[PDB]
Amino acid sequence: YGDITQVETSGASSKTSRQDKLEYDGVRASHTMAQTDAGRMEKYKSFINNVAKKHVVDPAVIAAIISRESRAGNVIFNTTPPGWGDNYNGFGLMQVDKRYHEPRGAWNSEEHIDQATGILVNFIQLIQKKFPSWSTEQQLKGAIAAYNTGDGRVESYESVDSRTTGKDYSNDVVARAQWYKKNGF
Numbered sequence: 789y790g791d792i793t794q795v796e797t798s799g800a801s802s803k804t805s806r807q808d809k810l811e812y813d814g815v816r817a818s819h820t821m822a823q824t825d826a827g828r829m830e831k832y833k834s835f836i837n838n839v840a841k842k843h844v845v846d847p848a849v850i851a852a853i854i855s856r857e858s859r860a861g862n863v864i865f866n867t868t869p870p871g872w873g874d875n876y877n878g879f880g881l882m883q884v885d886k887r888y889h890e891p892r893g894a895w896n897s898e899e900h901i902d903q904a905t906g907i908l909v910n911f912i913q914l915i916q917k918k919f920p921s922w923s924t925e926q927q928l929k930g931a932i933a934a935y936n937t938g939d940g941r942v943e944s945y946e947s948v949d950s951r952t953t954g955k956d957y958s959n960d961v962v963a964r965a966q967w968y969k970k971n972g973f
């Protein structure tokens with residue numbers, strides 16, 4: 789769907805990087821945050837594999853979104869009820885936003901991952917129609933950015949993250965995905 793290994797990235801902003809108490813930012817910070825979540829990520833392997841097969845999306849991209857969205861459950865396992873974020877709008881491992889989609893499945897379920905990964909695919913389709921001459925890698929990064937901010941707030945490739953949380957969402961998610969691709973979980 790575009791090739792994640794060829795997407796350019798500047799990784800995590802300093803703000804994002806700070807929250808893991810890191811003294812550095814950027815791609816190395818993304819790698820470290822991805823590595824932090826890799827153990828928790830193992831629990832969801834059957835599900836991530838199944839869904840990646842169904843949507844034809846790299847499991848590293850799914851895993852990167854799980855890491856960025858909820859730290860593979862670390863910051864949502866204990867809300868009430870469990871599985872909630874973004875007050876109280878984001879549901880599950882991948883933080884499906886209830887305002888736009890009815891959240892399906894248990895917070896940590898295959899059904900949930902399926903939904904959220906389908907949402908990403910819909911954004912890949914939307915960004916390919918919006919910028920059909922961007923490269924497929926630019927398109928995939930825009931789709932990831934849209935997963936956070938809407939395809940309506942992805943205006944250019946250089947400013948792809950300018951309207952995202954932390955101004956770094958697709959930059960970070962891409963770097964984490966690159967880590968998971970290279971290292972596995």
Ligand SMILES: CC(=O)N[C@@H]1[C@@H](O)[C@H](O[C@@H]2O[C@H](CO)[C@@H](O[C@@H]3O[C@H](CO)[C@@H](O)[C@H](O)[C@H]3NC(C)=O)[C@H](O)[C@H]2NC(C)=O)[C@@H](CO)O[C@H]1O
Binds near residue numbers: 803872873874936953
């Ligand atoms: C290892 C660990 O648990 N570290 C915790 C930090 O991850 C956590 O920082 C906050 O992390 C959450 C999850 O990444 C961030 O919230 C998410 O933000 C994305 C957009 O980027 C949004 O789409 C998700 O819905 C949302 N999920 C939830 C559950 O709200 C949040 O923005 C981070 N906060 C900041 C200031 O960066 C910190 C607490 O901040 O605790 C660490 O232990």
Ligand SMILES: CC(=O)N[C@@H]1[C@@H](O)[C@H](O[C@@H]2O[C@H](CO)[C@@H](O)[C@H](O)[C@H]2NC(C)=O)[C@@H](CO)O[C@H]1O
Binds near residue numbers: 934936
């Ligand atoms: C994972 C998730 O739920 N992502 C959210 C986006 O869906 C959402 O963008 C909105 O997506 C809908 C497509 O299903 C569109 O109807 C709507 O046009 C679109 N919003 C914009 C501004 O383009 C965004 C909105 O910021 O939030 C995400 O959390």
